[PDB]
RNA sequence: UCUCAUGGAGAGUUCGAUCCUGGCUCAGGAUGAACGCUGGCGGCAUGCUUAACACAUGCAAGUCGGACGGGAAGUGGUGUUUCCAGUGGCGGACGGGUGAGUAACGCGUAAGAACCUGCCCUUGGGAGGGGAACAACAGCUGGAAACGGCUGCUAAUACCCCGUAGGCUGAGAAGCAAAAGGAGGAAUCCGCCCGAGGAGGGGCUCGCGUCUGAUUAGCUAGUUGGUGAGGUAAUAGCUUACCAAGGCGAUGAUCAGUAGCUGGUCCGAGAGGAUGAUCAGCCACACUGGGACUGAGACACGGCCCAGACUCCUACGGGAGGCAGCAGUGGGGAAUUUUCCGCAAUGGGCGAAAGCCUGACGGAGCAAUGCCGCGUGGAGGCAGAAGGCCCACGGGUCGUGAACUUCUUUUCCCGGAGAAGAAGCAAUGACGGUAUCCGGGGAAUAAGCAUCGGCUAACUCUGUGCCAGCAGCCGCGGUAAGACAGAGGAUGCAAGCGUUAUCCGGAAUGAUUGGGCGUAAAGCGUCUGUAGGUGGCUUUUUAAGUCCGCCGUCAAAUCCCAGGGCUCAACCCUGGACAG
């Protein structure tokens, strides 16, 4: 299905990162939407990602008692690069 | 293995069967993969849906005696 | 499960009930004590409406209730649909074709297997009749005798246009579904419905 | 009120509290009478009420009312008790079903007999 | 002598021998 | 005046009255219900909720002589044919029961990649040459029994070796590995070994949804990751050594308490509340705990081993056992059935088939437990009599009610005939001589239970006198009681009617739809501010929400709509779909 975009809280450990994913959900009774935030242990060989980064999260075979997820370069994002002003 | 057989429904003394494709180790009325035919002795109502039967027989489904003979009368074994 | 009690009584209290009795009530002779309840609570009015219905057709309450659920299910005007349902009953169509003296008589007839619906014997009163249906007497001596003497000696020709009758074999025929104006009694169905809002 | 607050679960229901705890979710319970005695009712109702203390199968001891007129009940009798509250007497939440086990039916009651456990007279 | 437990006994013994193998 | 709607009711009670806030109580539905009184019949269902507490007896898993050697019944004999322990083969991992444990990827839903797979299909190649044992049996012997001990003996589709192998290990070089015959006179059949697929059944992994408690605030060190070696059918702290210091947590971790979950069921105008019996799927367990073995498959309910607790047998030296399988007994309890028939149907197991076994299942029996149908008579019946009760004694009312006269026979009784259910060769039916059909009698065999002060439909009289008693709330009852008990009368339902228990409703009384906070319960004493929530206008972008179309799926049964079948209905069957 659709992979999960999130941002990195902790880069400290080797070949791993700790990602925070925020997703919105329409709370079952009262119909307003709420932010629920979950953490993930993501497998990242090469240790390319640092703290603060915005990274897409992919699914794969289990690499540990926790990490099921492969750290993947951000899928698509609006360029923060300056655009023309017509 | 996969077996095409009768599953018993209706009520006391009045019996009506569905013809169904189901793994042989499930119970007699238990859950199944596909419903295919319909059968009944007293109203002498019998008819089937042949593409399904053929698609299961193709993948190796074994019928049971009663069912086997029902398929015989409707000539599903000749097309095979 | 049937009302074997005094008729004239329920007649006095409720009103005129065709399906019960052809004998007009006594002067009533209650003018001595002049005892009244005062007037009737709205509840009593509604209750007597329902009771009217129920006793005209010989139906039990718990039966009436499920008829009413059927009614609330059906798509259309509730009270009307109800009255349809009550008026298509077999002993009732039997009565209203004058094949019987009254509804208890017609019920007795139906019950003893003296009737045929499309060459098939139906002995249960509540059998629901559907359009294009043949109401016949069983071909035996006694059945014919009953139907003949109860048909001929009663002069009334009111037949309400959905009901056909033919002379020698005495083939009754149900033509169609009842019309609200063709109903067998004077009743505000609105009241019975309002009573049944609480079930 | 505030939605934000309602999503902290600020609505919780008040559970149903039973009127006859000693029954423990049953229609009846059998018990043995520890004592049979009389009590005076809360004023202005004065009379003398017939009550017996019963020790039950669920272990509790309660005080239950005996209906009708007259009774044969005495200590170490096995009766059957049912729910329902007598507004008169403080603390009495239970009756004694008449006509079963050790409580006989009320003698010479002709009407509404089923409540008091009485045969139909021939 | 007539001994009746097929399943029990027989499967037991078989299990032993096969286990040694 | 098109379309949508088939749906939301109140009443009493604080006061001398009123309006209000506010609780309590009632009218409705539903039971796996129990108890009281009463009880004719049929149709389809349902039947230990408590003690996952004990269990006497009988039965619930076997089959294959066409894998094999024997011996035992007959027969005249190895022409015929049966049974049978034993070795082997598959099956006992399905079916059946129960809900103790489990707040978990256990369940529902949706995804994934590192796997396994006997039987069943589809397909590519093969089955050479030997040898050795072990039961059985025999003899000797120990045992009360259970069950054993020595020495011989023997067959195989049972064991071992060698040769060959489109597979396995490995960068390669190389290295390594298989077989089984039995039927038939032959054709041919059922098998065997190695690969490669298919379908079904299993193992894992992850997103989301998955009870109450803050008077439970820090928890976790193989714990959270990395490498190296091991291990698993496969990924993995699954294991172990070393390195690093993480992981989870005020959006509630950890700890405690409760609970099997889901299709669904009950209620609700709807939004949603409560619950998880029967019926269907999944999990978990098998006297209490722990192990493994066999095997495609188990850590195995009617298998093994141990410990423990408990029951039995013993000739006292030792053994035997596990109903939460079907019935059945004790016990607990308000409470829940026969130690029944049958493999004929469907479904399983084994077999070449004949066939055998199936307390799964099909049926019967018991019980108003529930839903549904029918009955207990129909038509006429001076308006005269007996009797109950009321009466201002005039009369009223039980009452067309009965008695009485005719008609009818569903049900009852006595006789007859008598299915489908059975599937294509006939045969073969537990139900059952039942369902149904024809005849003969004959109103004949069959009505109770609540209530009658208000809510709430239905009223008077005798008996009692703050007594006896009633009551769901308000409250009745101190001499004429519409509220107690009796009678008559009436009303409501009706083979049921009431009472108690449980749940939702009404309750807008925990309020999203749908409430409040000056004085009725309710604004922190007042600020500063962190997380958190919302946030002015204009243009562009993106498309996460949002919206529309199409696809996959959300099992069948249930609910909804449309037909069809049991005489109708309940129930069953087909087809289809809104929601979300
Ligand atoms: Mg046929
Ligand atoms: Mg009466
Ligand atoms: Mg309602
Ligand atoms: Mg609000
Ligand atoms: Mg309530
Ligand atoms: Mg006050
Ligand atoms: Mg007052
Ligand atoms: Mg209020
Ligand atoms: Mg009720
Ligand atoms: Mg009885
Ligand atoms: Mg239990
Ligand atoms: Mg035994
Ligand atoms: Mg047997
Ligand atoms: Mg043979
Ligand atoms: Mg044999
Ligand atoms: Mg063989
Ligand atoms: Mg021979
Ligand atoms: Mg043998
Ligand atoms: Mg032997
Ligand atoms: Mg099992
Ligand atoms: Mg099982
Ligand atoms: Mg069962
Ligand atoms: Mg539990
Ligand atoms: Mg816990
Ligand atoms: Mg999951
Ligand atoms: Mg989860
Ligand atoms: Mg799982
Ligand atoms: Mg095998
Ligand atoms: Mg070949
Ligand atoms: Mg060879
Ligand atoms: Mg070799
Ligand atoms: Mg071999
Ligand atoms: Mg031969
Ligand atoms: Mg030969
Ligand atoms: Mg293969
Ligand atoms: Mg739940
Ligand atoms: Mg370590
Ligand atoms: Mg509501
Ligand atoms: Mg159960
Ligand atoms: Mg089940
Ligand atoms: Mg297990
Ligand atoms: Mg036990
Ligand atoms: Mg164990
Ligand atoms: Mg193994
Ligand atoms: Mg087993
Ligand atoms: Mg075990
Ligand atoms: Mg057992
Ligand atoms: Mg032991
Ligand atoms: Mg033992
Ligand atoms: Mg043993
Ligand atoms: Mg049992
Ligand atoms: Mg007992
Ligand atoms: Mg007892
Ligand atoms: Mg019972
Ligand atoms: Mg069979
Ligand atoms: Mg069979
Ligand atoms: Mg076979
Ligand atoms: Mg038997
Ligand atoms: Mg059964
Ligand atoms: Mg009986
Ligand atoms: Mg019945
Ligand atoms: Mg009965
Ligand atoms: Mg009862
Ligand atoms: Mg009924
Ligand atoms: Mg009459
Ligand atoms: Mg007759
Ligand atoms: Mg009949
Ligand atoms: Mg035949
Ligand atoms: Mg007859
Ligand atoms: Mg009134
Ligand atoms: Mg009373
Ligand atoms: Mg009540
Ligand atoms: Mg007075
Ligand atoms: Mg006096
Ligand atoms: Mg008096
Ligand atoms: Mg007087
Ligand atoms: Mg009274
Ligand atoms: Mg009376
Ligand atoms: Mg009841
Ligand atoms: Mg509410
Ligand atoms: Mg409240
Ligand atoms: Mg308020
Ligand atoms: Mg004040
Ligand atoms: Mg205040
Ligand atoms: Mg202030
Ligand atoms: Mg203040
Ligand atoms: Mg303060
Ligand atoms: Mg501030
Ligand atoms: Mg801020
Ligand atoms: Mg913002
Ligand atoms: Mg804006
Ligand atoms: Mg469905
Ligand atoms: Mg329909
Ligand atoms: Mg029909
Ligand atoms: Mg359907
Ligand atoms: Mg959809």
UniProtKB/Swiss-Prot annotation, chain A:
Keywords recorded for this protein, A-Z: Chloroplast, Plastid, Ribonucleoprotein, Ribosomal protein, RNA-binding, rRNA-binding, Transit peptide
Protein name per its UniProtKB record: Small ribosomal subunit protein uS17c
GO cellular component annotations of the record: chloroplast; ribonucleoprotein complex; ribosome
Subunit structure: Component of the chloroplast small ribosomal subunit (SSU). Mature 70S chloroplast ribosomes of higher plants consist of a small (30S) and a large (50S) subunit. The 30S small subunit contains 1 molecule of ribosomal RNA (16S rRNA) and 24 different proteins. The 50S large subunit contains 3 rRNA molecules (23S, 5S and 4.5S rRNA) and 33 different proteins.
Chain coiled-coil ranges: none
Task performed by this protein: Component of the chloroplast ribosome (chloro-ribosome), a dedicated translation machinery responsible for the synthesis of chloroplast genome-encoded proteins, including proteins of the transcription and translation machinery and components of the photosynthetic apparatus.
A GO BP entry: translation
Subcellular locations according to the entry: Plastid, Chloroplast
Highest taxon, organism lineage: Eukaryota
Keyword Cell inner membrane: no
Family: Belongs to the universal ribosomal protein uS17 family.
Native source species: Spinacia oleracea (Spinach)
Major subcellular site: plastid
GO molecular function, one term: structural constituent of ribosome
Curated annotation (Swiss-Prot), chain B:
Recorded GO MF terms: structural constituent of ribosome
Location, primary (coarse class): plastid
A single BP term in Gene Ontology: mitochondrial translation
Keywords in alphabetical order: Chloroplast, Plastid, Ribonucleoprotein, Ribosomal protein
GO CC list: chloroplast; mitochondrion; small ribosomal subunit
Domain of life: Eukaryota
Entry's localization field: Plastid, Chloroplast
Oligomer status and interactors: Component of the chloroplast small ribosomal subunit (SSU). Mature 70S chloroplast ribosomes of higher plants consist of a small (30S) and a large (50S) subunit. The 30S small subunit contains 1 molecule of ribosomal RNA (16S rRNA) and 24 different proteins. The 50S large subunit contains 3 rRNA molecules (23S, 5S and 4.5S rRNA) and 33 different proteins.
PANTHER family: 30S RIBOSOMAL PROTEIN S16 (PTHR12919), SMALL RIBOSOMAL SUBUNIT PROTEIN BS16M (PTHR12919:SF20)
Listed HAMAP family: Ribosomal_bS16 (MF_00385)
Free-text function comment from the UniProt entry: Component of the chloroplast ribosome (chloro-ribosome), a dedicated translation machinery responsible for the synthesis of chloroplast genome-encoded proteins, including proteins of the transcription and translation machinery and components of the photosynthetic apparatus.
Protein name: Small ribosomal subunit protein bS16c
Organism, scientific name: Spinacia oleracea
Curated annotation (Swiss-Prot), chain C:
Pfam short name (any one): Ribosomal_S4
Disulfide bonds: none
SMART domains, alphabetized: Ribosomal_S4, S4
Top-rank taxon, per record: Eukaryota
CDD domains: S4 (cd00165)
Localization per Swiss-Prot or TrEMBL: Plastid, Chloroplast
GO biological process, one term: translation
Domain S4 RNA-binding, chain residue ranges per copy: 88-148
Key words, A-Z: Chloroplast, Plastid, Ribonucleoprotein, Ribosomal protein, RNA-binding, rRNA-binding
InterPro entries listed in its UniProt record: Ribosomal_uS4, Ribosomal_uS4_bac-type, Ribosomal_uS4_CS, Ribosomal_uS4_N, S4_RNA-bd, S4_RNA-bd_sf
Coiled-coil zones: none
Recorded GO MF terms: rRNA binding; structural constituent of ribosome
Family matches, as PROSITE patterns: RIBOSOMAL_S4 (PS00632), S4 (PS50889)
GO CC entries: chloroplast; small ribosomal subunit
Disordered: annotated span: 14-42
Task performed by this protein: Component of the chloroplast ribosome (chloro-ribosome), a dedicated translation machinery responsible for the synthesis of chloroplast genome-encoded proteins, including proteins of the transcription and translation machinery and components of the photosynthetic apparatus.
Family: Belongs to the universal ribosomal protein uS4 family.
Subunit architecture: Component of the chloroplast small ribosomal subunit (SSU). Mature 70S chloroplast ribosomes of higher plants consist of a small (30S) and a large (50S) subunit. The 30S small subunit contains 1 molecule of ribosomal RNA (16S rRNA) and 24 different proteins. The 50S large subunit contains 3 rRNA molecules (23S, 5S and 4.5S rRNA) and 33 different proteins.
Protein name listed in UniProt: Small ribosomal subunit protein uS4c
Organism of provenance: Spinacia oleracea
Name of the coding gene: rps4
UniProtKB/Swiss-Prot annotation, chain D:
Domain of life according to the entry: Eukaryota
Pfam families: Ribosom_S12_S23
Cellular localization per UniProt: Plastid, Chloroplast
InterPro entries, alphabetized: NA-bd_OB-fold, Ribosomal_uS12, Ribosomal_uS12_bac
Keywords in alphabetical order: Chloroplast, Plastid, Ribonucleoprotein, Ribosomal protein, RNA-binding, rRNA-binding
Alphabetized CDD domains for the sequence: Ribosomal_S12
Predominant subcellular localization, coarse grouping: plastid
GO cellular component terms given for this protein: chloroplast; ribosome; small ribosomal subunit
Keyword Glycosyltransferase listed: no
GO MF annotation list: rRNA binding; structural constituent of ribosome
Single Gene Ontology BP annotation: translation
Family as reported in the entry's similarity comment: Belongs to the universal ribosomal protein uS12 family.
Function field: Component of the chloroplast ribosome (chloro-ribosome), a dedicated translation machinery responsible for the synthesis of chloroplast genome-encoded proteins, including proteins of the transcription and translation machinery and components of the photosynthetic apparatus.
Oligomeric form and interacting partners: Component of the chloroplast small ribosomal subunit (SSU). Mature 70S chloroplast ribosomes of higher plants consist of a small (30S) and a large (50S) subunit. The 30S small subunit contains 1 molecule of ribosomal RNA (16S rRNA) and 24 different proteins. The 50S large subunit contains 3 rRNA molecules (23S, 5S and 4.5S rRNA) and 33 different proteins.
HAMAP family noted in UniProt: Ribosomal_uS12_B
More details: Exons 2 and 3 are cis-spliced, while a trans-splicing reaction is required to link exons 1 and 2.
Entry protein name: Small ribosomal subunit protein uS12cz/uS12cy
Organism: Spinacia oleracea (Spinach)
Encoding gene (name): rps12-A
């Amino acid at each position: 299905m659709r992979s999960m975009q999130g941002k990195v809280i902790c880069a400290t450990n080797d070949k791993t990162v700790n990602v925070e994913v925020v997703r919105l959900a329409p709370h079952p009774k009262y119909k307003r939407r709420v932010r629920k935030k979950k953490k993930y242990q993501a497998h990242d060989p090469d240790n390319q990602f640092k703290v603060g980064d915005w990274v897409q999260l992919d699914k794969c075979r289990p690499i540990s008692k926790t990490k099921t997820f492969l750290a993947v370069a951000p899928e698509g994002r609006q360029s923060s690069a300056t655009r023309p002003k017509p | 293995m996969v077996k095409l057989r009768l599953k018993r429904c209706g009520r006391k003394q009045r019996a009506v069967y569905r013809i169904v494709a189901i793994d042989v180790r499930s119970r007699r009325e238990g859950r199944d993969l596909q419903k295919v035919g319909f059968y009944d002795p007293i109203k002498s109502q019998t008819y089937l849906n042949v593409p399904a039967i053929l698609d299961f027989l193709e993948k190796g489904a074994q019928p049971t005696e009663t069912v086997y003979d029902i398929l015989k009368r409707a000539e599903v074994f000749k097309e095979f | 499960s049937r009302y074997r009690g005094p008729r004239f009584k329920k007649i006095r209290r409720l009103g005129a009930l065709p399906g019960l009795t052809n004998k007009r009530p006594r002067a009533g002779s209650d003018l001595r004590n002049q005892s009244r309840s005062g007037k009737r609570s709205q509840y009593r009015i509604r209750l007597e409406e329902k009771q009217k219905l129920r006793f005209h057709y010989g139906i039990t309450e718990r039966q009436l209730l499920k008829y009413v659920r059927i009614a609330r299910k059906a798509k259309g005007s509730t009270g009307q649909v109800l009255l349809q349902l009550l008026e298509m009953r077999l002993d009732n169509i039997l009565f209203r074709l004058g094949m019987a003296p009254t509804i208890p008589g017609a019920r007795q007839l139906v019950n003893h297997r003296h009737i045929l619906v499309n060459g098939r014997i139906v002995d249960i009163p509540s059998y629901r009749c559907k359009p294009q249906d043949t109401i016949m007497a069983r071909d035996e001596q006694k059945s014919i005798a009953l139907i003949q003497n109860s048909l001929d000696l009663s002069p009334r020709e009111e037949l309400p246009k959905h009901l056909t009758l033919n002379p020698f074999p005495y083939k009754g025929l149900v033509n169609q579904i009842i019309d609200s104006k063709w109903v067998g009694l004077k009743i505000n169905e609105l009241l019975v419905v309002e009573y049944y809002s609480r079930q | 009120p505030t939605i934000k607050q309602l999503i902290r679960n600020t609505r919780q229901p008040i559970r149903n509290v039973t009127k006859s705890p000693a029954l423990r979710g049953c229609p009846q319970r059998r018990g043995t009478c520890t004592r049979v005695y009389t009590i005076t009712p809360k004023k202005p109702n004065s009379a003398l009420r017939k009550v017996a203390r019963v020790r039950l199968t669920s272990g509790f001891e309660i005080t239950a009312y005996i209906p009708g007129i007259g009774h044969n009940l005495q200590e170490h009798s096995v009766v059957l008790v049912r729910g329902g509250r007598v507004k008169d007497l403080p603390g009495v939440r239970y009756h004694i079903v008449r006509g079963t086990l050790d409580a006989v039916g009320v003698k010479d009651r002709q009407q509404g007999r089923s409540k008091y456990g009485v045969k139909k007279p021939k | 002598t007539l001994k009746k437990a097929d399943s029990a006994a027989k499967r037991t013994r078989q299990a032993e021998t096969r286990r040694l193998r």
